[PDB]
Amino acid sequence: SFSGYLKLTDNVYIKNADIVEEAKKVKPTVVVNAANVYLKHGGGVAGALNKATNNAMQVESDDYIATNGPLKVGGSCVLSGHNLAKHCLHVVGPNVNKGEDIQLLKSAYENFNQHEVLLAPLLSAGIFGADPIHSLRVCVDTVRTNVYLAVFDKNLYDKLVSSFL
Ligand SMILES: CS(=O)(=O)NCC1CCNCC1
């Protein structure tokens, strides 16, 4: 199972790790992708997860969008986890760099509650532009299922742990 995580709460755990490497190692039931409404996995966590699938995630995602249309900001869909996990839960957190409402971050994290255990990044963090300290607080106050957070940046991981209330 998951190794080397620091326990933050009864159900939230955190580790300084590359989520692709973490997924390839653990092969969790669910890996969360920091998706956008179009499932265009260009950069950030989405670009990295997609590249690890040799673009199979993008091919599957384009078929999903052609059939269903775009996701809502705060919404999600379950697709294959390919070589990373049994499933990938593509969750759309608000992108404050595209002027999206930060209030949607709680709705985005609520998607995690449909899965008993997940390997995930901090939603809306990184290139999505939100404060990762705020994202972690919304995560621990919203998610009730077991979430293993992978934070790529060591300096950000240290800041998150040292400022965790
Ligand atoms: C760690 S998890 O609860 O996400 N998955 C359970 C098993 C162990 C890891 N490989 C898949 C089977």
Swiss-Prot record:
Activity regulation info: Inhibited in vitro by GRL-0617.
Cell location: Host endoplasmic reticulum membrane
Macro domain: residues covered: 1-165
Topological type in the membrane: Multi-pass membrane protein
Catalytic activity, reaction form: Thiol-dependent hydrolysis of ester, thioester, amide, peptide and isopeptide bonds formed by the C-terminal Gly of ubiquitin (a 76-residue protein attached to proteins as an intracellular targeting signal)
Domain of life, source organism: Viruses
Assembly, per entry: May form homohexamers. Interacts with N protein.
Function, as annotated: Responsible for the cleavages located at the N-terminus of the replicase polyprotein. Participates together with nsp4 in the assembly of virally-induced cytoplasmic double-membrane vesicles necessary for viral replication. Antagonizes innate immune induction of type I interferon by blocking the phosphorylation, dimerization and subsequent nuclear translocation of host IRF3. Also prevents host NF-kappa-B signaling. In addition, PL-PRO possesses a deubiquitinating/deISGylating activity and processes both 'Lys-48'- and 'Lys-63'-linked polyubiquitin chains from cellular substrates.
Record's protein name: Papain-like protease nsp3
Name of the gene encoding the protein in the UniProt record: rep
